[PDB]
Amino acid sequence: PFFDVQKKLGVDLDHWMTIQSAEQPHRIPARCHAFEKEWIECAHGIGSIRAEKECKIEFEDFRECLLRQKTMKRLNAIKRQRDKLIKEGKYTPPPHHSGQEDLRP
Amino acid sequence: AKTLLHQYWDIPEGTECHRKTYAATSIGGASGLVVSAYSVALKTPTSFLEGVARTGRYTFTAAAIGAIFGLTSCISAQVREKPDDPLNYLIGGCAGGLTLGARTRSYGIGAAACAYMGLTAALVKMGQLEGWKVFAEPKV
Amino acid sequence: VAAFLKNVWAKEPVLVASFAIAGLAVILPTLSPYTKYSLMINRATPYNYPVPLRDDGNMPDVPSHPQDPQGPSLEWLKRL
Amino acid sequence: MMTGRQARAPLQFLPDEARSLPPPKLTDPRLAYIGFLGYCSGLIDNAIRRRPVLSAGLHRQFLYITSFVFVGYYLLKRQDYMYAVRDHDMFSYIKSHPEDFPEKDKKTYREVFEEFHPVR
Amino acid sequence: PGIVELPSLEDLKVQEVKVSSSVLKAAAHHYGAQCDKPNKEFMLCRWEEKDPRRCLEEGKLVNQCALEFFRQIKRHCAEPFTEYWTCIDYSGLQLFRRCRKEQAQFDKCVLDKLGWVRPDLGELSKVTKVKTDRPLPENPYHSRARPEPNPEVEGDLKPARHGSRLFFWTM
Amino acid sequence: MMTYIVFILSIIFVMGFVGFSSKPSPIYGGLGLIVSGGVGCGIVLNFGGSFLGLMVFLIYLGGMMVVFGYTTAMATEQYNKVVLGTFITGLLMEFLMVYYVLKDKEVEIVFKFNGMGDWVIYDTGDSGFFSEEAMGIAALYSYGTWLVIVTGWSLLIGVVVIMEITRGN
Amino acid sequence: MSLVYMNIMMAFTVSLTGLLMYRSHLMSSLLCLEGMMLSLFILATLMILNSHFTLASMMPIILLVFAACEAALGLSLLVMVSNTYGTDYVQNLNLLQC
Amino acid sequence: MNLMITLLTNFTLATLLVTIAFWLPQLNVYSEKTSPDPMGSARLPFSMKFFLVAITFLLFDLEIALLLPLPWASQTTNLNTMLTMALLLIFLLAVSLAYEWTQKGLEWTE
Amino acid sequence: MNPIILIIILMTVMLGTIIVMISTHWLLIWIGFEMNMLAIIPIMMKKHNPRATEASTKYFLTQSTASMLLMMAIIINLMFSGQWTVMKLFNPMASMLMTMALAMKLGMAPFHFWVPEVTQGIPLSSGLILLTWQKLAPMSVLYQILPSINLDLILTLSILSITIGGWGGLNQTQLRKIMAYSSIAHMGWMTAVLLYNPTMTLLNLIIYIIMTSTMFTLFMANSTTTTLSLSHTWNKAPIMTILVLITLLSMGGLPPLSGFMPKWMIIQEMTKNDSIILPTLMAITALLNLYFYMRLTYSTALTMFPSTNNMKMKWQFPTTKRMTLLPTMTVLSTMLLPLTPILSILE
Amino acid sequence: IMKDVPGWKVGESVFHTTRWVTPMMGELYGLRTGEEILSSTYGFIWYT
Ligand SMILES: CCCCCCCCCCCCCCCCCC(=O)OC[C@H](COP(=O)(O)OCCN)OC(=O)CCCCCCCCCCCCCCCCC
Ligand SMILES: CCCCCCCCCCCCCCCCCC(=O)OC[C@H](COP(=O)(O)OCCN)OC(=O)CCCCCCCCCCCCCCCCC
C-alpha cells in the first residue's frame, strides 16, 4: 500500500528531492535538465504502459545525456583511427592540437 | 539454463540420438551441479576429498539419468515412427528412474522413480505438445 | 519556586547558566526587531545574474537602466 | 488495478461520487450477519473470562453489536461504491472502443451444425 | 541521427578585449553602467534562444562596445586608471577596499572628463527591461508533439448490475 | 599516466578491499579498511567533493573506525593458507580486468564500461561564486526539514536502544 | 559508461562476498559490511557530483549517519555475545538449531 | 598537486627519521639479553564502561556531522526554518545527553 | 524495561513502517527500514538470555545485508534513471537486487533460514510483532514496483517458499517454529499472486495477519510454547481448546472457514491468466500445512492428554491476562466467508 | 581523419534532437595534448 498522505494533507515531505529537474537552490541547473524536462512532459498523465512506448526517443536522449555511452564510443573510434594513422605515418597533427595555438580570450 | 532447454528442444524427436543425448546429459549435469553446490554449502564435508567425491557422485548420477532418458526416448521415437507421443517420454522416464535405482542400489526407490518420473516426463511431453504454460505471463 | 532557583544556583551554577543561555537563545530571535534585517540582507545578495525581461510595453515598475529611479533600493542597508 | 482511478483523490474512504448511489438499508442481510458476528464475539468474550455467557454484562454485548454494525455499514458503503465504479469504467470503455467489441452475428439453430455423438 | 551545424571559422573571428582580470575589475562598475544596453540585449538573446550560434552577432556587438569603452577610458584617464588597476592587481583576492584612494581619484577624474557616475549598491544587480526587435522563439526546446491524454470519466455513477457478480453472491 | 589518477586510485581502493575482505585478522582488516577509506576519500577529492571527502576522514575514519578498532582491542586477544589464496585470486581477477579494460578500451561484465580516462565526463563550465556541493549540503536546514527530523529522531532512539541492550536487565 | 564506476562495483562485490562467507570472527563480518557501505558512499557521491544534482549532495551524509548507527548497534550486539561466551566466534551462536 | 607533494615529503621524512631511529643502534653489537605488566598472564577484563563511552562518542560524532554545515546554511533566505531546525538539532543533542545523565550512563567515568 | 521507553520504541517501529508506506523517495524508504529495524531490536532482547542475543545477532546480520542490497539497487536505479521517485525501476539488475533484498527482509525461501531460529529465540509477544507487523513494509514496496519485477524470479521464490515451508513445518514440535514455517508458506502464496492481482495479495495479507494474531494471542493467554504444554490446556480451560481448534482449522484453508477465502480467490485469479499447474501444485503443497495443523488439533482439542497433579492448584485461580481483542479476531478468522465480496474495499 | 571507414558521417550528433547540448570536456579537449587536459579538468581542483 502507498498511502498518499502528502497529497491528502498538502504537505511536501520528499517531492523536492524526487527529481533532478526540480527547484534547486540558487537556480543551479543540472547537466541534463532539458532532457529530463522533455521526458517528464512526455510521461505525465498517460501511465507507464503508454509512456514506455510512445515517446521513447525522449528517454533515449535522457539516458544518453546521463551515461554518455555513444559519445564515449564515438570518441574511442576517432582516437583509435587517429592512432592507427599516426603509427602508419600518413597523418600529421595540426599545430593547434599540439599546444601551439595561443587560445582566443 | 535457458539455452540448454532450447538446444534440447530444437532437435526434432527421433532424429538425432547423439545430440539429444548430449543435450539431456548437459541439463542433468547442470542440475546435479546445483544440487551438489547446495549440499556442500549447507552440509559441510569432512574434507576437500569427501566434498569433491560427493560432487562427482551427484553430478555423475544426474548426468547418467539425463543421458539414459534422452537415449531411450529418442530410440523409442525412432522405432515406433511416432515422434509426437508421450508414451516415448514415459518409457524414457522409467528408464531414468531405473538408472536412479541402479545408482542408489535399491530396487524399490528405482521402481517408484520409474513410475513417478515417467509420469512427469509424459506430463512435460503433453505440455510441450499442447502449449501448457508453467510460468504464465500476466494477461488480464 | 523562588528558593529553588537560589538553591540550584548555589549548588549547580553550570547547569543554571546553561539553561539560562539556552532560554535566551530560544526566546530572543522571536523578540528582536533586527531579524527582518537579516532576512532582507540575505535575500538582497546578488549571487546569480539578474536576467532581463523582454519589454512588451506594460512594465512601468521595471527600470530600463540600473540608474533609473524605479527598482529595489539598498539605502536602508547603506544607512541601517 | 484501479489505482489510476484512486490516484487523483487519494486517501478518501468514500469520494463525492459515492453519494449519488443508494445507501444500504439498515435491514441489510449483510449488516444483520455482521451484527450476529458482533454478538458471537461478545459471547466468546464472556466465555473466555469465565462469566455466565448469556447473562453477564449486557452493556458489553450491546456495545459489541453496535460497533460491528457501525463498521460494517461503512464497509458495505465502500464495497457498493467500488463495484459501481467497476461497472461504470467497464461500460465507458466498451462504449468508447466499438471496433474491439463487435456485434456477434447471432444465428438460429436451423442454420448451425452440431455433431451428434450417440450414447449406445 | 542528424548532423550538428557549426559556424565557419571566419564567423568566429573578432578582435578581442585583450586586458587582464584586474583591468576588467577596476572599471567593472563603469563598464556595467555605460555599456549596459548591448550587454543586456545579448544576455536576453542568450537566455531566450538557448543557443550561442543564435547569439554570435550580439556577442560581437558586446565586444565592439567594450572596446570602445576602453578606448574612451584611454583617451582621457589613462594614468589614474593605470594606478587604480595596478593597486587592484597587487592584492591576492583583488579587494576593492585596499584601493579606496586611487578609486576616488579615478572616479573624480572620469567624472570631470567624461561625465560618468559610478552606480551605487544594488543598482547593477537590478532586473531591467530590454526593447529588442528579434522575435521570441516559440519553441526553443525543439520539442515534438506531446502524446494525447487518456479519456477521462464522464457521467453519473450508477449501481452495479446484479451486484458483485462474484460466484453465487446476489449482491 | 597522470590523466589516469582517479583510475589508479580506484585500483588501489579495490585492491585494499580485496586485502581486508580476505579476513586475515580483525585488526588487520581494520587497518586495510582505514587505508581503503583514505584512498576512496582521495578519489572523491579528485572528483571535486572536498566536503564529502573531509566528512569521510572526520566521521568514518577519525570517529567510527576508531570505535571499531577500540572494540577490536577489547576482544580478539593478541598472539594462513585461505587468506593468501583469496588475496592472490582477487589480485588475479583485478589485474585481468585491468588488462582487458586497457587492451580493448571497452569491457562488458554486467554493464558496459569504457576504457578511456575518466576526465571526459567533466563539465566545461564554472559554478560562479559558490561551490555546488556546499550549497546542496547547506540546503538541509532550509529544504530538508523532514530529513532532519527523521535522522535526529533515529539518532536519539539509537542512543536509547544502545543504553537499553547493554544494561543486561 | 565510466571506469571508476566499474572499480567501485567490483569493490562492492568483493566486500559482499567477504561478508557472505564468514571465516571465524563476527568482527570481520562487521568490517565487510561497513566496507560495503563505504563503497556505496563513493559510488553515490561520484554519481551525484558528476550529474550536478545539487540537492542530492545531502544524501551521502544521511547514508553515513544511518549506517554508522547500524554499526553501533552491531558492535553492541557483538559485545553482548562476547560477554556471554568469552569470544566473538560465530560457531558459538548455534543454540537455536533446536 | 602541491598538496600531495607535501604529503609525500612529510611521509618520507617521517619514515627516514624512523628508519634512522631503528637501525642505527642495530649497527651496535652491545649484548644479547634473555629477559626471563603487574598481571602475569591474566585475561583482559571486558569493561562495559569503556565501550559505553566509545559508543556515546560515536553517536555524538554523528550528530556533529549533522551539525557541521551550519555556517553555510545560515546564508539561506528561509532563516526562520533554518534557525528552528538548528535549535531542534542541538536540543536533540541536549536531550540525548540528559537521558544518558539520568539513567546512570555516565557512572564511574562521569 | 520502562513502560515509557517501551512506548517510545513501539511508536518508533510504527513510525518507521509509516515512513516506508507514505514516502515517494527511495532514500526515505531506506531510512524507514533502518528506523524500524533499529527500534525493533530491543523488543527481541526484552528478556536478556543468550538465546535472545543470538536471535538478535542473526536478525541484525540478515537485515543489514538486505538493507545494503536495497541501497545498491536504489543507487543503480539512480545511475540509470537520474531520479528517486518510488515507482517502476529502470534497470533489470536494480530490479533483481531489490526483489532479492525484499525477499531477504520477508524471509522467503531460500533466504528463509533466519526466520525459525529468530522466532524461537524471542518471546511470544515480540515474535507476534515480528511475524505480523514487520511484513507490512516490504509487501508495500513490492506493491509499488510490480511493473519491474521479473516473473520467473518471483514465481520461483513463491513455489520454493511454499514447498520449503511445508516440509520444514512437518518436523517441528515447538509452536514458534511451526508459526515461522507457516509464515514462510503464506508469504509464498502472497507473492505468488502478486503480479496478477495485488488486491488478492492485500486480502491474503490481512487474513494471515488476523489468523496469526489470534493464534499467538491464544498462545500467550495460555502461556504455552511447546506441543505438550498446549496439550495440557483441556484440563485448565476447554473453551481455549475449542478456539485453537477452530482457528487451526481455519489456518489450513478448510471451508467454510475464513481461511479458505484467500487461496480460493488466488486460484480464481491465477486461472484467468491461463496458469493451471501452479495453483494445483500450491494447493497440493498446502495440504502439508494442513497436516501439521491437524496434528496440533489432535494433540490439543480432539484428545485428552494426561495431566499432572498441580493442575488443581491452577484450577483454584482465575486468569487476569489482558487478552486484547481475542474474541474479535477469533470471530473474524472463522466466520468471514459469507462476507467474501468485502474484498472490493481493498482495490 | 575519419575517411577510410565505410558508413561514417562527419559531425553526426548522437542525440535524436536538434536542440543545442553543452559539449563534453572530452568533446573539446579530446584531440589535444595531455598537458592541456590536465590543466583544464584537474586544474581547479589541484590548485593549492
Ligand atoms: C527550556 C530551555 C532550553 C532547554 C534545552 C537546551 C538545554 C541546554 C543545556 C543542556 C543540558 C543537558 C544536561 C542536563 C542534565 C540535567 C539533569 C541532571 O543532571 O540532574 C541531576 C542534577 C543533580 O545532580 P546529581 O543528581 O548529584 O548528579 C551528579 C552531579 N552532581 O540536578 C540538578 O542539578 C538540577 C537540574 C534541573 C534544574 C535546573 C534549573 C535551571 C534554571 C535556570 C533558570 C531558568 C532558565 C530558563 C529555562 C527553564 C528551565 C526550567
Ligand atoms: C493493507 C493493510 C495496512 C495495515 C493495516 C493494519 C495492520 C495492523 C497490524 C497489527 C499488528 C499487531 C502486532 C502485534 C501486537 C502489537 C502490540 C504489542 O506490542 O503487543 C505485545 C505486548 C507485549 O506486552 P507484554 O505484557 O510483555 O506481553 C507478554 C505477555 N504478558 O502486549 C501484549 O502481549 C498484550 C496481550 C494482548 C496483545 C494483543 C495484540 C493484538 C494485535 C492484533 C489485532 C488484530 C489485527 C489488527 C486488526 C486487523 C488488521 C488487518
Fold and architecture overview:
The structure is cut from a larger assembly and holds ten protein chains of ten kinds. By secondary structure, chain C is mainly α. Chain C has four helices and one strand, in the order αααβα. Chain C has helices spanning 2-11, 13-27, 35-42, 75-79, and one strand spanning 53-54. Chain F has 169 residues and is mostly helical. In chain F, helix 1 (5-21) packs antiparallel against helix 2 (26-47). The termini of chain F are far apart. One 1,2-Distearoyl-sn-glycerophosphoethanolamine sits between chains C (8, 12, 15-16, 18-20, 22-23, 26) and H (91, 94, 97-98, 101). Residues 10, 125, 128-129, 132-133, 136, 202, 206, 209-210, 213, 217, 220, 322, 324-325, 329 of chain I line the site of one 1,2-Distearoyl-sn-glycerophosphoethanolamine. Chain H: InterPro entries: NADH_UbQ/plastoQ_OxRdtase_su3 (IPR000440), NDAH_ubi_oxred_su3_sf (IPR038430). Chain H: It is an enzyme of class 7 (translocase).
Oligomer: part of a larger assembly
Q: What is the H/E order of chain C?
A: HHHEH
Terminal Cα span of chain C: 43 Å
| Class computed from helices, strands and strand pairing of chain C | mainly alpha
**Beta-strand content of chain A:** under 5%
Biggest interface between chains? F-G, 74 and 60 residues
* Share in β-strands of chain C: under 5%
Unique ligands: 1,2-Distearoyl-sn-glycerophosphoethanolamine
H/E topology pattern of chain A: HHHHH
Name the overall outline of chain A.
elongated
Query: Main β-sheet of chain C, in a few words?
Result: none
Instruction: Please give the share of residues in helix of chain C.
Output: 40-55%
Please tell me what the overall shape of chain C is. rod-shaped
- The portion of residues assigned to helices of chain A is 40-55%
| Largest β sheet strand count, sense and barrel closure of chain A | none
Rg calculated over all Cα atoms of chain A: 23 Å
Compute the CA-based radius of gyration of chain C: 24 Å
Count of discrete alpha- or pi-helical segments spanning 4 or more residues of chain C: 4
DSSP strand count of chain A = 0
Query: What is the count of helical runs of chain A?
Result: 5
EC number (chain G): 7.1.1.2
GO molecular function (chain G): NADH dehydrogenase (ubiquinone) activity
Subcellular location (chain G): Mitochondrion inner membrane
Catalytic activity (chain G): a ubiquinone + NADH + 5 H(+)(in) = a ubiquinol + NAD(+) + 4 H(+)(out)
